[PDB]
Amino acid sequence: APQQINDIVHRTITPLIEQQKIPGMAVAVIYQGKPYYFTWGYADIAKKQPVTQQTLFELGSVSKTFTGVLGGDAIARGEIKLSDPTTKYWPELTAKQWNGITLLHLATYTAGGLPLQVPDEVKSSSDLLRFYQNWQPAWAPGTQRLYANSSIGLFGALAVKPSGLSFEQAMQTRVFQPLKLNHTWINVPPAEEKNYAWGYREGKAVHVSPGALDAEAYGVKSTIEDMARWVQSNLKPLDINEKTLQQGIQLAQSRYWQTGDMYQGLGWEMLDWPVNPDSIINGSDNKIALAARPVKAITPPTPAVRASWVHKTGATGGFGSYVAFIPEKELGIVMLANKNYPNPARVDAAWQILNALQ
């Protein structure tokens, strides 16, 4: 491994782990297209299992990038259009407030204030219908961004309806398999349980609990190797042999809305490179905690801009993840941890590392 890569990673991550009390961590740096791997600590404290390049971490909301891309793939296949009314794919959604709410709004959290979480009370399909029918927007569609699992979650579920595949089957066949992400899972199979890290929340070992639209919004588990390959696939989508998938990746990094210095993609969020630290450390997306922001429509959406900081933060109760890349520089980072530690700390470390390497 290049000593420059070795030194910046270790010097940045070691104190991060110490200060955040992170039980276990995996990091990939993509430098000139090539992945370099680094691991620390424990996937399972009790059983003394170390973090390896084969350890599975819960990605949490980094799952939304897969959802966005699968969605873009369905657009490329001609199965859906982002301008489609939500009701085209869910005709039972007859409540009036849904008039004017498109798949674009769902995908980009601009539907008019769909809540961050689907309520735990929603435990059936009829429950979910009731929930969406009864939801009252605070804002007109396409006027404000409010980060919401119930928004992109619903986008994910509807985007696959024409295919007739379940969200999981469609994700596996159309994204995971073609990209050879053979250790990326919506549901961790028994064969992989030995590699599945425990997350840690207030000293307890925890895994994400099932919930409505969890797959679509926060339910992917992946290894550092697969995540590096995910970054490579998004850094240079033209190297991909399946056309619709290559096009789907491109669509996911298009710029649909602007708030402040950030542009909303499908799952991915983007800022112009070079970035103000600062404006990302600071920043988004979210406002964590939690931020209704006015959006300016980008009419029409700007195609994927090479000179971008493209990123997504993700958490579950026991895990914290971060992915960032700069297409123009063939440069990226994945940080996977089995503790949910503050977003600004992840962004700072990712910035420290990538700035030094570009």
Ligand X SMILES: C[C@H](C(=O)O)N1C(=O)[C@@H]2[C@H]3CC[C@H](C3)[C@@H]2C1=O
Which CB atom, from 39 or from 149, has the smaller least distance to ligand X?
Answer: 149
Which CB atom, from 117 or from 172, has the smaller least distance to ligand X?
Answer: 117
What values do phi and psi take at 184, rounded to 5? -120, 130
CB of 9 to ligand X, least distance (A): 23
Q: Note whether 67 binds ligand X by CB under 6 A.
A: no
Q: Note whether 355 binds ligand X by CB under 6 A.
A: no
The one segment of 67-75, 136-144, 173-181, 314-322 that binds ligand X by CB under 6 A: 314-322
Other CB atoms within 10 A of residue 29 CB: 26
CB of 316 to ligand X, least distance (A): 5
Angstrom distances, CA of residue 354 to CA of 28, 76, 112, 323, 329: 11, 32, 35, 11, 10
Site string for ligand X, 266-305 (x = CB under 6 A): ----------------------------------------
Among 222, 233, 254, 313, binds ligand X (CB under 6 A): 313
Which CB atom, from 60 or from 248, has the smaller least distance to ligand X?
Answer: 60
CB of 76 to ligand X, least distance (A): 27
Distance CA 328, CA 306 (A): 5
Query: Which residues, in sequence order, are CB contacts of 29 under 8 Å at separation 6+?
Result: 5, 9, 35, 36, 38, 332, 333, 353, 357
Phi-psi region of 136 (alpha: psi -120 to 50; beta: other; left: phi over 0): beta
The one segment of 3-11, 86-94, 273-281, 313-321 that binds ligand X by CB under 6 A: 313-321
**For residue 7, what are its two tokens?**
């030194």
Give the residue numbers marked as catalytic. Answer: 61
What values do phi and psi take at 141, rounded to 5? -60, 145
Q: Name which of residues 178 to 217 contact ligand X (CB under 6 A).
A: 182
- 């029918």: which residue's tokens? 133
Q: Is 61 annotated as a binding residue?
A: yes
Q: Is 37 annotated as a binding residue?
A: no
What does DSSP say about strands 308-316 and 262-264: parallel, antiparallel, or unpaired? Answer: unpaired
Other CB atoms within 10 A of residue 177 CB: 13
Distance CA 232, CA 166 (A): 26
Among 52, 53, 117, 279, binds ligand X (CB under 6 A): 117
Q: Is 147 annotated as a binding residue?
A: yes
The one segment of 1-9, 103-111, 297-305, 309-317 that binds ligand X by CB under 6 A: 309-317
Among 315, 337, 347, 357, binds ligand X (CB under 6 A): 315
What does DSSP say about strands 24-31 and 144-145: parallel, antiparallel, or unpaired? Answer: unpaired
Query: Which residues, in sequence order, are CB contacts of 160 under 8 Å at separation 6+?
Result: 70, 74, 166, 167, 170
Q: Is 43 annotated as a binding residue?
A: no
Which CB atom, from 154 or from 315, has the smaller least distance to ligand X?
Answer: 315
Q: Note whether 316 binds ligand X by CB under 6 A.
A: yes
Task: Enumerate the known binding-site residues for a beta-lactam.
Answer: 61, 117, 147, 149, 315, 340
Task: Enumerate the known binding-site residues.
Answer: 61, 117, 147, 149, 315, 340
Residues binding ligand X (CB under 6 A): 60-61, 117, 149, 182, 218, 313-316
